[PDB]
Design a protein around this nucleic acid. Structure first.
Ligand SMILES: [Mg+2]
Ligand SMILES: [Mg+2]
Ligand SMILES: [Mg+2]
Ligand SMILES: [Mg+2]
Ligand SMILES: [Mg+2]
Ligand SMILES: [Mg+2]
Ligand SMILES: [Mg+2]
Ligand SMILES: [Mg+2]
Ligand SMILES: [Mg+2]
Ligand SMILES: [Mg+2]
Ligand SMILES: [Mg+2]
Ligand SMILES: [Mg+2]
Ligand SMILES: [Mg+2]
Ligand SMILES: [Mg+2]
Ligand SMILES: [Mg+2]
Ligand SMILES: [Mg+2]
Ligand SMILES: [Mg+2]
Ligand SMILES: [Mg+2]
Ligand SMILES: [Mg+2]
Ligand SMILES: [Mg+2]
Ligand SMILES: [Mg+2]
Ligand SMILES: [Mg+2]
Ligand SMILES: [Mg+2]
Ligand SMILES: [Mg+2]
Ligand SMILES: [Mg+2]
Ligand SMILES: [Mg+2]
Ligand SMILES: [Mg+2]
Ligand SMILES: [Mg+2]
Ligand SMILES: [Mg+2]
Ligand SMILES: [Mg+2]
Ligand SMILES: [Mg+2]
Ligand SMILES: [Mg+2]
Ligand SMILES: [Mg+2]
Ligand SMILES: [Mg+2]
Ligand SMILES: [Mg+2]
Ligand SMILES: [Mg+2]
Ligand SMILES: [Mg+2]
Ligand SMILES: [Mg+2]
Ligand SMILES: [Mg+2]
Ligand SMILES: [Mg+2]
Ligand SMILES: [Mg+2]
Ligand SMILES: [Mg+2]
Ligand SMILES: [Mg+2]
Ligand SMILES: [Mg+2]
Ligand SMILES: [Mg+2]
Ligand SMILES: [Mg+2]
Ligand SMILES: [Mg+2]
Ligand SMILES: [Mg+2]
Ligand SMILES: [Mg+2]
Ligand SMILES: [Mg+2]
Ligand SMILES: [Mg+2]
Ligand SMILES: [Mg+2]
Ligand SMILES: [Mg+2]
Ligand SMILES: [Mg+2]
Ligand SMILES: [Mg+2]
Ligand SMILES: [Mg+2]
Ligand SMILES: [Mg+2]
Ligand SMILES: [Mg+2]
Ligand SMILES: [Mg+2]
Ligand SMILES: [Mg+2]
Ligand SMILES: [Mg+2]
Ligand SMILES: [Mg+2]
Ligand SMILES: [Mg+2]
Ligand SMILES: [Mg+2]
Ligand SMILES: [Mg+2]
Ligand SMILES: [Mg+2]
Ligand SMILES: [Mg+2]
Ligand SMILES: [Mg+2]
Ligand SMILES: [Mg+2]
Ligand SMILES: [Mg+2]
Ligand SMILES: [Mg+2]
Ligand SMILES: [Mg+2]
Ligand SMILES: [Mg+2]
Ligand SMILES: [Mg+2]
Ligand SMILES: [Mg+2]
Ligand SMILES: [Mg+2]
Ligand SMILES: [Mg+2]
Ligand SMILES: [Mg+2]
Ligand SMILES: [Mg+2]
Ligand SMILES: [Mg+2]
Ligand SMILES: [Mg+2]
Ligand SMILES: [Mg+2]
Ligand SMILES: [Mg+2]
Ligand SMILES: [Mg+2]
Ligand SMILES: [Mg+2]
Ligand SMILES: [Mg+2]
Ligand SMILES: [Mg+2]
Ligand SMILES: [Mg+2]
Ligand SMILES: [Mg+2]
Ligand SMILES: [Mg+2]
Ligand SMILES: [Mg+2]
Ligand SMILES: [Mg+2]
Ligand SMILES: [Mg+2]
Ligand SMILES: [Mg+2]
Ligand SMILES: [Mg+2]
Ligand SMILES: [Mg+2]
Ligand SMILES: [Mg+2]
Ligand SMILES: [Mg+2]
Ligand SMILES: [Mg+2]
Ligand SMILES: [Mg+2]
Ligand SMILES: [Mg+2]
Ligand SMILES: [Mg+2]
Ligand SMILES: [Mg+2]
Ligand SMILES: [Mg+2]
Ligand SMILES: [Mg+2]
Ligand SMILES: [Mg+2]
Ligand SMILES: [Mg+2]
Ligand SMILES: [Mg+2]
Ligand SMILES: [Mg+2]
Ligand SMILES: [Mg+2]
Ligand SMILES: [Mg+2]
Ligand SMILES: [Mg+2]
Ligand SMILES: [Mg+2]
Ligand SMILES: [Mg+2]
Ligand SMILES: [Mg+2]
Ligand SMILES: [Mg+2]
Ligand SMILES: [Mg+2]
Ligand SMILES: [Mg+2]
Ligand SMILES: [Mg+2]
Ligand SMILES: [Mg+2]
Ligand SMILES: [Mg+2]
Ligand SMILES: [Mg+2]
Ligand SMILES: [Mg+2]
Ligand SMILES: [Mg+2]
Ligand SMILES: [Mg+2]
Ligand SMILES: [Mg+2]
Ligand SMILES: [Mg+2]
Ligand SMILES: [Mg+2]
Ligand SMILES: [Mg+2]
Ligand SMILES: [Mg+2]
Ligand SMILES: [Mg+2]
Ligand SMILES: [Mg+2]
Ligand SMILES: [Mg+2]
Ligand SMILES: [Mg+2]
Ligand SMILES: [Mg+2]
Ligand SMILES: [Mg+2]
Ligand SMILES: [Mg+2]
Ligand SMILES: [Mg+2]
Ligand SMILES: [Mg+2]
Ligand SMILES: [Mg+2]
Ligand SMILES: [Mg+2]
Ligand SMILES: [Mg+2]
Ligand SMILES: [Mg+2]
Ligand SMILES: [Mg+2]
Ligand SMILES: [Mg+2]
Ligand SMILES: [Mg+2]
Ligand SMILES: [Mg+2]
Ligand SMILES: [Mg+2]
Ligand SMILES: [Mg+2]
Ligand SMILES: [Mg+2]
Ligand SMILES: [Mg+2]
Ligand SMILES: [Mg+2]
Ligand SMILES: [Mg+2]
Ligand SMILES: [Mg+2]
Ligand SMILES: [Mg+2]
Ligand SMILES: [Mg+2]
Ligand SMILES: [Mg+2]
Ligand SMILES: [Mg+2]
Ligand SMILES: [Mg+2]
Ligand SMILES: [Mg+2]
Ligand SMILES: [Mg+2]
Ligand SMILES: [Mg+2]
Ligand SMILES: [Mg+2]
Ligand SMILES: [Mg+2]
Ligand SMILES: [Mg+2]
Ligand SMILES: [Mg+2]
Ligand SMILES: [Mg+2]
Ligand SMILES: [Mg+2]
Ligand SMILES: [Mg+2]
Ligand SMILES: [Mg+2]
Ligand SMILES: [Mg+2]
Ligand SMILES: [Mg+2]
Ligand SMILES: [Mg+2]
Ligand SMILES: [Mg+2]
Ligand SMILES: [Mg+2]
Ligand SMILES: [Mg+2]
Ligand SMILES: [Mg+2]
Ligand SMILES: [Mg+2]
Ligand SMILES: [Mg+2]
Ligand SMILES: [Mg+2]
Ligand SMILES: [Mg+2]
Ligand SMILES: [Mg+2]
Ligand SMILES: [Mg+2]
Ligand SMILES: [Mg+2]
Ligand SMILES: [Mg+2]
Ligand SMILES: [Mg+2]
Ligand SMILES: [Mg+2]
Ligand SMILES: [Mg+2]
Ligand SMILES: [Mg+2]
Ligand SMILES: [Mg+2]
Ligand SMILES: [Mg+2]
Ligand SMILES: [Mg+2]
Ligand SMILES: [Mg+2]
Ligand SMILES: [Mg+2]
Ligand SMILES: [Mg+2]
Ligand SMILES: [Mg+2]
Ligand SMILES: [Mg+2]
Ligand SMILES: [Mg+2]
Ligand SMILES: [Mg+2]
Ligand SMILES: [Mg+2]
Ligand SMILES: [Mg+2]
Ligand SMILES: [Mg+2]
Ligand SMILES: [Mg+2]
Ligand SMILES: [Mg+2]
Ligand SMILES: [Mg+2]
Ligand SMILES: [Mg+2]
Ligand SMILES: [Mg+2]
Ligand SMILES: [Mg+2]
Ligand SMILES: [Mg+2]
Ligand SMILES: [Mg+2]
Ligand SMILES: [Mg+2]
Ligand SMILES: [Mg+2]
Ligand SMILES: [Mg+2]
Ligand SMILES: [Mg+2]
Ligand SMILES: [Mg+2]
Ligand SMILES: [Mg+2]
Ligand SMILES: [Mg+2]
Ligand SMILES: [Mg+2]
Ligand SMILES: [Mg+2]
Ligand SMILES: [Mg+2]
Ligand SMILES: [Mg+2]
Ligand SMILES: [Mg+2]
Ligand SMILES: [Mg+2]
Ligand SMILES: [Mg+2]
Ligand SMILES: [Mg+2]
Ligand SMILES: [Mg+2]
Ligand SMILES: [Mg+2]
Ligand SMILES: [Mg+2]
Ligand SMILES: [Mg+2]
Ligand SMILES: [Mg+2]
Ligand SMILES: [Mg+2]
Ligand SMILES: [Mg+2]
Ligand SMILES: [Mg+2]
Ligand SMILES: [Mg+2]
Ligand SMILES: [Mg+2]
Ligand SMILES: [Mg+2]
Ligand SMILES: [Mg+2]
Ligand SMILES: [Mg+2]
Ligand SMILES: [Mg+2]
Ligand SMILES: [Mg+2]
Ligand SMILES: [Mg+2]
Ligand SMILES: [Mg+2]
Ligand SMILES: [Mg+2]
Ligand SMILES: [Mg+2]
Ligand SMILES: [Mg+2]
Ligand SMILES: [Mg+2]
Ligand SMILES: [Mg+2]
Ligand SMILES: [Mg+2]
Ligand SMILES: [Mg+2]
Ligand SMILES: [Mg+2]
Ligand SMILES: [Mg+2]
Ligand SMILES: [Mg+2]
Ligand SMILES: [Mg+2]
Ligand SMILES: [Mg+2]
Ligand SMILES: [Mg+2]
Ligand SMILES: [Mg+2]
Ligand SMILES: [Mg+2]
Ligand SMILES: [Mg+2]
Ligand SMILES: [Mg+2]
Ligand SMILES: [Mg+2]
Ligand SMILES: [Mg+2]
Ligand SMILES: [Mg+2]
Ligand SMILES: [Mg+2]
Ligand SMILES: [Mg+2]
Ligand SMILES: [Mg+2]
Ligand SMILES: [Mg+2]
Ligand SMILES: [Mg+2]
Ligand SMILES: [Mg+2]
Ligand SMILES: [Mg+2]
Ligand SMILES: [Mg+2]
Ligand SMILES: [Mg+2]
Ligand SMILES: [Mg+2]
Ligand SMILES: [Mg+2]
Ligand SMILES: [Mg+2]
Ligand SMILES: [Mg+2]
Ligand SMILES: [Mg+2]
Ligand SMILES: [Mg+2]
Ligand SMILES: [Mg+2]
Ligand SMILES: [Mg+2]
Ligand SMILES: [Mg+2]
Ligand SMILES: [Mg+2]
Ligand SMILES: [Mg+2]
Ligand SMILES: [Mg+2]
Ligand SMILES: [Mg+2]
Ligand SMILES: [Mg+2]
Ligand SMILES: [Mg+2]
Ligand SMILES: [Mg+2]
Ligand SMILES: [Mg+2]
Ligand SMILES: [Mg+2]
Ligand SMILES: [Mg+2]
Lengths: 116, 149, 202, 64
RNA sequence: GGGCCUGACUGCGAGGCCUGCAAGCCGAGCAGGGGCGAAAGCCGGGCCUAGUGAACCGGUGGUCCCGUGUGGAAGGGCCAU
RNA sequence: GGAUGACCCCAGGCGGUAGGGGAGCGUUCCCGAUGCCGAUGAAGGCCGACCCGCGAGGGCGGCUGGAGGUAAGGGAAGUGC
RNA sequence: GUGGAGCCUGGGAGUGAGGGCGCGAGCGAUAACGUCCGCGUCCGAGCGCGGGAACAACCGAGACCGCCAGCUAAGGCCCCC
RNA sequence: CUGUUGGGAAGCAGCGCCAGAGAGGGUGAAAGCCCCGUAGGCGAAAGGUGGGGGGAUAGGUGAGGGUACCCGAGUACCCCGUGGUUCGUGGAGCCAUGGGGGAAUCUGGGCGGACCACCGCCUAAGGCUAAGUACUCCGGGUGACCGAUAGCGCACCAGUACCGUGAGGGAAAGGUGAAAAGAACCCCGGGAGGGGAGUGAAAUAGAGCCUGAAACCGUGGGCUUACAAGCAGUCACGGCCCCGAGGGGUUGUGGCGUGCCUAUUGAAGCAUGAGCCGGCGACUCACGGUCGUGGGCGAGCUUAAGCCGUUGAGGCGGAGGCGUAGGGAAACCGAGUCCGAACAGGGCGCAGCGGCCGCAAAGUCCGCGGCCGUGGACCCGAAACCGGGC
RNA sequence: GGGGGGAACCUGGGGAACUGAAACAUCUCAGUACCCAGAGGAGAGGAAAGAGAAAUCGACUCCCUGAGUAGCGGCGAGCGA
């Protein structure tokens, strides 16, 4: 019996096309360019979710550093003091305190100078 | 038990291998053929049972031996098949070429020769020949060797 | 070794039959596979680039035309062209081992016997070729048509009478085979039918 | 169509009871005058072909 | 350097070297019939490593294995070259 | 561990071209089928931010469409761009 | 020394254009992103990740998936960063 | 038959009925019982056939004994040159015959693989001869055959249009609706076209007609954009818009970021291929082999062609094949055998589990899968060669 | 009475090459493709100057098998009673 393509290929192409909604010109319009665009995007996404973890940590650090230097020390000194104090509050949080709770950040800074 | 229940046992019906159907299958593109060259070509190589790249082959360098025959061909001479005493175990009374054919022991168009593997049994065994040890075992067990001609 | 209801003027007696104790569903499957494959017509065909109607002239020169190279237009790469490795007339049959069929025949009957679904009958009352006649008898023998029946008998008059019923498949005893037994829910035999089947599985 | 028996193989080689392949030692067809007696004698025997080579020859003999 | 000699053996060959194959190489030992030596023993060419050529086709000596109804014959096989 | 591939627990492996192997998805067709779904709407199409699945996919919903479709389990290939 | 170790029999391959680097040589001119061998490595197939401005093979390190958590490696900490 | 939904009943519901007929197709949707059919039956004045039956006709039929008349001529036969056969000059016979020579009539002749003998087989040089066999223009039956890029080249007015001096090449092109009820009449317009009206269950079913995808072109809306540097994405945050501790659309800024395929030592590569989209498009099949695997039987396993049966029913058929013993060039011997003087040495060979029971197994058959051989053998592509024609 | 036509099939008279032999000449492809003549619903063959080892068989044709056997073969590729 014969098994002509029939419905199947239209159906794969739409799947891809639908994922490509939003892309520029032929990239959302032509299955071929869609797919090409999509390979790139799966990789960036993968790569970039890896690096979001870095992107944020670098941010927290810049903030913590700014807050430290209001209290006359730098990030490297502050971190070492915390290490020595045994304080394990992570940077996501150090950074939130630095902005939302300055009295608390100050005490931590204190603990950090003292700890050395 | 019904038509919906009829199933071949596991492994009784394996799927075929399909090549040249996409990357996930791991047999796409080159279709497990590797790249380029004669063996990847449609039509492929020479008889790899024989041919060796142009150098004289393994086979054709070994000496021929013996009588290969001449026109008008095979010389007609009587042919003998041996059946051992042990194969005669199953019979009682008499064995003859014909019975042995039926047992699926002696092939048609061969003469019967009785041979010595096994024990003789006091039977009347009729055949075209006996080996030295067959005759011995047979006489000793009180069986009766009968030559045909 | 199995006890099989037999319908009679005496009434529901019994009969002892040695049918296989064990059923080998794979083997039953093999017999059906064979039966259904050998009935195949094998008539799907297609044309090769050689059997297609066009000429063998190379359509345009090999080089310098700025187009792709082609030979004739019968090639499978052309719409209109031949088909690659399409179907050609084919014989689907093969010789399934006789002992397998034999063993299969037996096991199928055995399977029904083991389910109580096998019924032997002495003769058929008033059925003289009329569907209503068979229908009467059938009801009277516990066949309300809620279950499919493979009616096996050498009596032509009984076969005609039953053949139009949607729930009845009919056969001469020489025709008995495992697909038909397995296809139907209930097996009904003449003694004379049952006799040949015994002779067949011997 | 059925496979054909290769006649150069049938004429040079024999398959033994256990399926080894056996052929005559090569090297005393001629130029024998200066060969030692140990040489001529030893080349007078059959040898058993190396497995991969025998395996190939065996396939050319489909009905022995 | 000399004396006697032909083991520059015939039938084999445990076990190895080498090695993709096929080749190549070394070889104790047993048997037959010998050489030299009083004997122990040595001798299956050459101190060694190059001096060579698979298979096909054919020649010659031997064998007496096959011989197209049969006896021969033709022609082949087998051993040697 | 329990007895068996039910699932739980602990540990370890899991970059990959040629290429070996395994397990699946889907397309046409056959048995299942004198059956079953179907105008209270078949297939097909267009949507979907929902459900299941690692995935190939499979559901469900709305709109279109207007007459076909076809399960569990098996079978066979003109089967996937 | 229990390892995606080893050995044996079998089925299926692909490969038989390599390349850079380090070390040892030859060839070349103590030239070549040169050439030809040896040991090793990497790229090939790790054009996946960090460093090296950028950069297959230099340094760091072998990516099963997810995290807006932690510690490090080479390399870095004046601003771009 | 009735009721019901519905444009329409054959759907659903109620109560029936036929069946040697529940194959199938139609009928406004899905019908055994409405139509056409189906099972089962029936039918030819005329032409054709008539392998069966019957009849006729032609034709057919003895035994010793004697005679030695006849028994297929440029023939046999031999030689030369060739072909045919499995036979390629081979030890080359046989059958055939182009050249030369050239008989006999059964006490004749040919043959059994050079030749000779013996022993056999057969009767050359005249002719005919059903059936069993091949094929498919034609008719019919049937499909795990196609379904309008398929299936024939052609579903259609196709071997046509068209191309070519010619031989020759050779397309595309199917579908309103149940029914034409195929839109009277009015309005704008030269018309085409449209807007009303009307038909229809439906008219983006309106004839440029089922469905109506995609590329492609547009109108309208949301968000966005004129100091910005880009494989066009991605991650993050913020703004706006939408659906209603959430999502969706959009994108300003910031981070990161060298298309796809191919071929390569190595490509974003300034190396190949691709304008985009839809459809067509490449590892198959037979027969053998080899391994693996699911089963059947197991010192055995298995049938082929055919025959009988069936008309989606199977069976019979043992001829044959593989296996049961190997070794040897062979004669030949045989659990051995070959080399050899060898009772030497060596090559190649020989030797289940449990309780008579069961279990397993040699082997072999069938299925399935991998790979191999032969075929065009994964698909596409030469330049060329050859035949016959124009 | 012939003549001319007929899709395949059939006999007879002529008769390639690519290709395979991983080059090529014998060999192969193949007595195939093709041209020609002739028949006919078939055609051919057919009633032993046979076979070939059996003291046998008994026209011819066709299928299975014998058998990829016997053999043939640059004893190659292959061919094949
Ligand atoms: Mg397709
Ligand atoms: Mg299609
Ligand atoms: Mg499609
Ligand atoms: Mg696709
Ligand atoms: Mg779609
Ligand atoms: Mg899809
Ligand atoms: Mg966008
Ligand atoms: Mg766009
Ligand atoms: Mg665009
Ligand atoms: Mg578009
Ligand atoms: Mg994707
Ligand atoms: Mg990631
Ligand atoms: Mg990353
Ligand atoms: Mg990290
Ligand atoms: Mg400071
Ligand atoms: Mg620290
Ligand atoms: Mg810390
Ligand atoms: Mg299959
Ligand atoms: Mg794939
Ligand atoms: Mg694989
Ligand atoms: Mg791979
Ligand atoms: Mg590709
Ligand atoms: Mg390839
Ligand atoms: Mg492969
Ligand atoms: Mg391969
Ligand atoms: Mg390739
Ligand atoms: Mg390669
Ligand atoms: Mg390629
Ligand atoms: Mg290459
Ligand atoms: Mg190549
Ligand atoms: Mg290759
Ligand atoms: Mg190619
Ligand atoms: Mg080709
Ligand atoms: Mg080739
Ligand atoms: Mg050479
Ligand atoms: Mg032979
Ligand atoms: Mg007695
Ligand atoms: Mg079929
Ligand atoms: Mg078919
Ligand atoms: Mg066809
Ligand atoms: Mg076709
Ligand atoms: Mg063609
Ligand atoms: Mg053609
Ligand atoms: Mg054609
Ligand atoms: Mg044509
Ligand atoms: Mg044509
Ligand atoms: Mg042509
Ligand atoms: Mg042409
Ligand atoms: Mg041409
Ligand atoms: Mg060109
Ligand atoms: Mg161009
Ligand atoms: Mg072009
Ligand atoms: Mg082109
Ligand atoms: Mg061209
Ligand atoms: Mg072409
Ligand atoms: Mg062409
Ligand atoms: Mg063509
Ligand atoms: Mg076609
Ligand atoms: Mg066409
Ligand atoms: Mg066509
Ligand atoms: Mg095709
Ligand atoms: Mg093809
Ligand atoms: Mg083709
Ligand atoms: Mg095919
Ligand atoms: Mg057929
Ligand atoms: Mg098959
Ligand atoms: Mg068959
Ligand atoms: Mg019925
Ligand atoms: Mg049924
Ligand atoms: Mg030799
Ligand atoms: Mg030689
Ligand atoms: Mg010699
Ligand atoms: Mg010689
Ligand atoms: Mg020497
Ligand atoms: Mg030498
Ligand atoms: Mg010597
Ligand atoms: Mg055989
Ligand atoms: Mg054997
Ligand atoms: Mg002396
Ligand atoms: Mg040795
Ligand atoms: Mg060696
Ligand atoms: Mg001595
Ligand atoms: Mg001695
Ligand atoms: Mg002495
Ligand atoms: Mg010695
Ligand atoms: Mg010297
Ligand atoms: Mg020397
Ligand atoms: Mg040669
Ligand atoms: Mg040669
Ligand atoms: Mg010779
Ligand atoms: Mg003779
Ligand atoms: Mg003799
Ligand atoms: Mg003779
Ligand atoms: Mg004599
Ligand atoms: Mg004699
Ligand atoms: Mg003499
Ligand atoms: Mg002689
Ligand atoms: Mg001789
Ligand atoms: Mg010799
Ligand atoms: Mg000798
Ligand atoms: Mg894990
Ligand atoms: Mg693992
Ligand atoms: Mg890992
Ligand atoms: Mg992996
Ligand atoms: Mg696996
Ligand atoms: Mg698999
Ligand atoms: Mg599924
Ligand atoms: Mg699909
Ligand atoms: Mg599937
Ligand atoms: Mg079908
Ligand atoms: Mg049905
Ligand atoms: Mg149906
Ligand atoms: Mg319903
Ligand atoms: Mg309706
Ligand atoms: Mg609806
Ligand atoms: Mg469909
Ligand atoms: Mg569907
Ligand atoms: Mg979906
Ligand atoms: Mg729908
Ligand atoms: Mg319908
Ligand atoms: Mg179905
Ligand atoms: Mg199904
Ligand atoms: Mg089934
Ligand atoms: Mg295809
Ligand atoms: Mg292990
Ligand atoms: Mg490993
Ligand atoms: Mg490994
Ligand atoms: Mg292996
Ligand atoms: Mg494989
Ligand atoms: Mg290879
Ligand atoms: Mg390679
Ligand atoms: Mg090479
Ligand atoms: Mg290179
Ligand atoms: Mg190198
Ligand atoms: Mg390397
Ligand atoms: Mg190199
Ligand atoms: Mg190096
Ligand atoms: Mg250094
Ligand atoms: Mg160096
Ligand atoms: Mg050097
Ligand atoms: Mg200088
Ligand atoms: Mg560099
Ligand atoms: Mg270099
Ligand atoms: Mg350098
Ligand atoms: Mg250098
Ligand atoms: Mg290296
Ligand atoms: Mg590569
Ligand atoms: Mg690396
Ligand atoms: Mg690596
Ligand atoms: Mg790297
Ligand atoms: Mg990078
Ligand atoms: Mg990468
Ligand atoms: Mg890097
Ligand atoms: Mg970097
Ligand atoms: Mg960087
Ligand atoms: Mg989380
Ligand atoms: Mg740290
Ligand atoms: Mg450091
Ligand atoms: Mg820096
Ligand atoms: Mg800057
Ligand atoms: Mg109404
Ligand atoms: Mg009604
Ligand atoms: Mg009703
Ligand atoms: Mg019927
Ligand atoms: Mg019907
Ligand atoms: Mg109907
Ligand atoms: Mg309607
Ligand atoms: Mg219905
Ligand atoms: Mg229906
Ligand atoms: Mg109906
Ligand atoms: Mg009738
Ligand atoms: Mg009728
Ligand atoms: Mg008389
Ligand atoms: Mg006379
Ligand atoms: Mg005469
Ligand atoms: Mg005359
Ligand atoms: Mg002549
Ligand atoms: Mg000839
Ligand atoms: Mg010869
Ligand atoms: Mg001859
Ligand atoms: Mg003449
Ligand atoms: Mg006479
Ligand atoms: Mg005479
Ligand atoms: Mg004659
Ligand atoms: Mg003669
Ligand atoms: Mg003669
Ligand atoms: Mg004769
Ligand atoms: Mg004769
Ligand atoms: Mg005639
Ligand atoms: Mg007749
Ligand atoms: Mg006839
Ligand atoms: Mg016919
Ligand atoms: Mg027809
Ligand atoms: Mg279809
Ligand atoms: Mg259809
Ligand atoms: Mg069309
Ligand atoms: Mg068409
Ligand atoms: Mg269409
Ligand atoms: Mg037509
Ligand atoms: Mg057309
Ligand atoms: Mg027309
Ligand atoms: Mg012209
Ligand atoms: Mg014209
Ligand atoms: Mg043309
Ligand atoms: Mg066309
Ligand atoms: Mg219509
Ligand atoms: Mg109509
Ligand atoms: Mg008007
Ligand atoms: Mg007007
Ligand atoms: Mg108008
Ligand atoms: Mg208007
Ligand atoms: Mg109007
Ligand atoms: Mg209305
Ligand atoms: Mg409606
Ligand atoms: Mg619409
Ligand atoms: Mg419509
Ligand atoms: Mg249109
Ligand atoms: Mg319609
Ligand atoms: Mg439309
Ligand atoms: Mg439209
Ligand atoms: Mg559109
Ligand atoms: Mg707009
Ligand atoms: Mg500026
Ligand atoms: Mg601006
Ligand atoms: Mg961005
Ligand atoms: Mg941020
Ligand atoms: Mg949002
Ligand atoms: Mg946003
Ligand atoms: Mg976004
Ligand atoms: Mg940042
Ligand atoms: Mg770029
Ligand atoms: Mg790059
Ligand atoms: Mg791609
Ligand atoms: Mg490309
Ligand atoms: Mg290239
Ligand atoms: Mg290149
Ligand atoms: Mg290059
Ligand atoms: Mg670029
Ligand atoms: Mg560039
Ligand atoms: Mg560019
Ligand atoms: Mg270029
Ligand atoms: Mg490019
Ligand atoms: Mg190129
Ligand atoms: Mg173009
Ligand atoms: Mg486009
Ligand atoms: Mg496409
Ligand atoms: Mg394959
Ligand atoms: Mg196989
Ligand atoms: Mg098997
Ligand atoms: Mg069996
Ligand atoms: Mg068993
Ligand atoms: Mg055989
Ligand atoms: Mg021995
Ligand atoms: Mg031994
Ligand atoms: Mg078995
Ligand atoms: Mg293989
Ligand atoms: Mg072919
Ligand atoms: Mg092919
Ligand atoms: Mg193939
Ligand atoms: Mg071509
Ligand atoms: Mg030309
Ligand atoms: Mg030429
Ligand atoms: Mg020429
Ligand atoms: Mg010409
Ligand atoms: Mg001409
Ligand atoms: Mg005429
Ligand atoms: Mg005529
Ligand atoms: Mg002829
Ligand atoms: Mg003539
Ligand atoms: Mg001729
Ligand atoms: Mg002819
Ligand atoms: Mg000519
Ligand atoms: Mg030629
Ligand atoms: Mg060819
Ligand atoms: Mg060939
Ligand atoms: Mg050639
Ligand atoms: Mg060639
Ligand atoms: Mg040339
Ligand atoms: Mg040639
Ligand atoms: Mg050929
Ligand atoms: Mg020929
Ligand atoms: Mg022809
Ligand atoms: Mg004529
Ligand atoms: Mg006839
Ligand atoms: Mg006739
Ligand atoms: Mg005639
Ligand atoms: Mg006569
Ligand atoms: Mg045989
Ligand atoms: Mg040969
Ligand atoms: Mg020939």
């Amino acid at each position: 019996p014969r098994a002509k393509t029939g419905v199947v290929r239209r159906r794969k192409h739409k799947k891809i096309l639908k994922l490509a909604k939003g892309y520029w010109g032929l990239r959302s319009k032509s299955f071929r360019k869609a797919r090409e665009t999509l390979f790139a995007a799966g990789n960036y996404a993968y790569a970039h979710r890896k690096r979001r973890k870095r992107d944020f940590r670098r941010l927290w650090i810049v903030r913590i550093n700014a807050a430290c230097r209001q209290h006359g020390l730098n990030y490297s000194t502050f971190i070492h003091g915390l290490k020595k104090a045994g304080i394990e509050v992570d940077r996501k949080n150090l950074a939130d305190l630095a902005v939302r709770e300055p009295q608390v950040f100050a005490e931590l800074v204190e603990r950090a100078k003292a700890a050395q | 038990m019904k038509l919906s229940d009829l199933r071949p046992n596991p492994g009784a019906n394996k799927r075929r291998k399909r090549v040249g159907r996409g990357p996930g299958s791991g047999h796409g593109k080159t279709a497990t053929r590797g790249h380029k060259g004669q063996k990847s070509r449609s039509g492929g190589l020479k008889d790899p049972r024989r041919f060796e790249g142009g150098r004289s082959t393994t086979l054709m360098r070994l000496p021929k031996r013996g009588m290969q025959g001449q026109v008008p061909g095979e010389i007609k001479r009587p042919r003998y098949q041996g059946v051992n005493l042990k194969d005669l175990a199953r019979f009682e009374g008499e064995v003859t070429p014909e019975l042995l054919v039926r047992a699926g022991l002696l092939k048609k168009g061969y003469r019967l020769k009785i041979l010595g593997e096994g024990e003789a049994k006091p039977l009347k065994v009729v055949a075209h020949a006996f080996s030295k040890s067959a005759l011995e075992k047979l006489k000793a067990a009180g069986g009766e060797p009968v030559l045909l001609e | 070794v199995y006890q099989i209801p037999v319908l009679s003027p005496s009434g529901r007696r019994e009969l002892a039959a040695d049918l296989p104790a064990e059923i080998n569903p794979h083997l039953l499957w093999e017999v059906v596979r064979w039966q259904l494959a050998k009935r195949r017509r094998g008539t799907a065909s297609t044309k090769t680039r050689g059997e297609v109607a066009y000429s063998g002239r190379k359509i345009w020169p090999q080089k310098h035309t700025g187009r792709a190279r082609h030979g004739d237009i019968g090639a499978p790469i052309f719409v209109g062209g031949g088909v690659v490795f399409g179907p050609k007339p084919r014989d689907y049959s093969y010789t399934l081992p006789k002992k397998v069929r034999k063993k299969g025949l037996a096991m199928a009957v055995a399977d029904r016997a083991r389910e109580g679904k096998l019924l032997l009958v002495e003769a058929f009352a008033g059925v003289n070729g009329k569907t209503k006649e068979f229908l009467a008898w059938a009801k009277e023998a516990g066949l309300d048509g809620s279950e499919s029946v493979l009616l096996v008998t050498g009596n032509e008059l009984v076969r005609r009478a039953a053949r139009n019923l949607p729930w009845v498949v009919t056969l001469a005893p020489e025709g008995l085979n495992v697909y038909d037994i397995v296809r139907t829910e209930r097996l009904v035999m003449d003694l004379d039918a049952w006799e040949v089947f015994q002779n067949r599985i011997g | 169509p059925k496979m054909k028996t290769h006649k150069g193989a049938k004429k040079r080689v024999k398959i033994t009871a256990s399926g080894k392949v056996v052929a005559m030692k090569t090297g005393k067809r001629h130029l024998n005058w200066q060969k030692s007696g140990k040489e001529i004698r030893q080349k007078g025997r059959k040898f058993v072909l190396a497995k991969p080579e025998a395996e190939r020859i065996k396939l050319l003999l489909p009905y022995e």
